[PDB]
Design a protein around this ligand. Structure first.
Ligand SMILES: Nc1ncnc2c1ncn2[C@@H]1O[C@H](COP(=O)(O)OP(=O)(O)OP(=O)(O)O)[C@@H](O)[C@H]1O
Ligand SMILES: [Mg+2]
Length: 121
């Protein structure tokens, strides 16, 4: 749980390209991925990816993922794409998946779900 926090000490949100920020590749757990948009997966195309990760996990780049926080610091990870890439990782029963984190705002989520957008907390 986390019924407490530090405090304000740096305008991170709306920060210009000189304030402070760290965006890089990160292994985000598969159990905390948010995907509210089903898709049609192909069993032959997943096999090709499952073969790359099993034959060479270095020639496989990360996917783009949006990093947004709720009204209570609750971090939520949204993914839109790499659908087939998720099946290969999910099929290999792996614990986490490489994904590029990109700080975003609830507005960016409205562009994708400007209708079924929930209330993050
Ligand atoms: N054996 C392989 N089979 C298919 N794609 C491969 C293979 N090895 C490398 N790749 C790369 O994996 C990437 C697959 O993910 P990408 O995000 O690019 O596109 P996508 O097919 O639209 O699907 P999703 O968003 O569902 O993963 C491709 O860009 C391709 O270049
Ligand atoms: Mg495409």
């Amino acid at each position: 749980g986390a019924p407490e926090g530090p405090g304000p000490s740096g305008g991170a949100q709306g920060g210009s390209i000189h304030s402070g920020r760290i965006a890089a590749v990160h292994n985000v757990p598969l159990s905390v991925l948010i995907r509210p948009l089903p898709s049609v997966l192909d069993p032959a195309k997943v096999q090709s990816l499952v073969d790359t990760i099993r034959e060479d996990p270095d020639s496989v780049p990360p996917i783009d993922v949006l990093w947004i926080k709720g009204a209570q610091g609750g971090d939520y990870f949204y993914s839109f794409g790499g659908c087939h890439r998720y099946a290969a990782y999910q099929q290999l029963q792996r614990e986490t998946i490489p994904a590029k984190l990109v700080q975003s705002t609830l507005s960016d989520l409205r562009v994708y779900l400007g209708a079924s957008t929930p209330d993050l907390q």
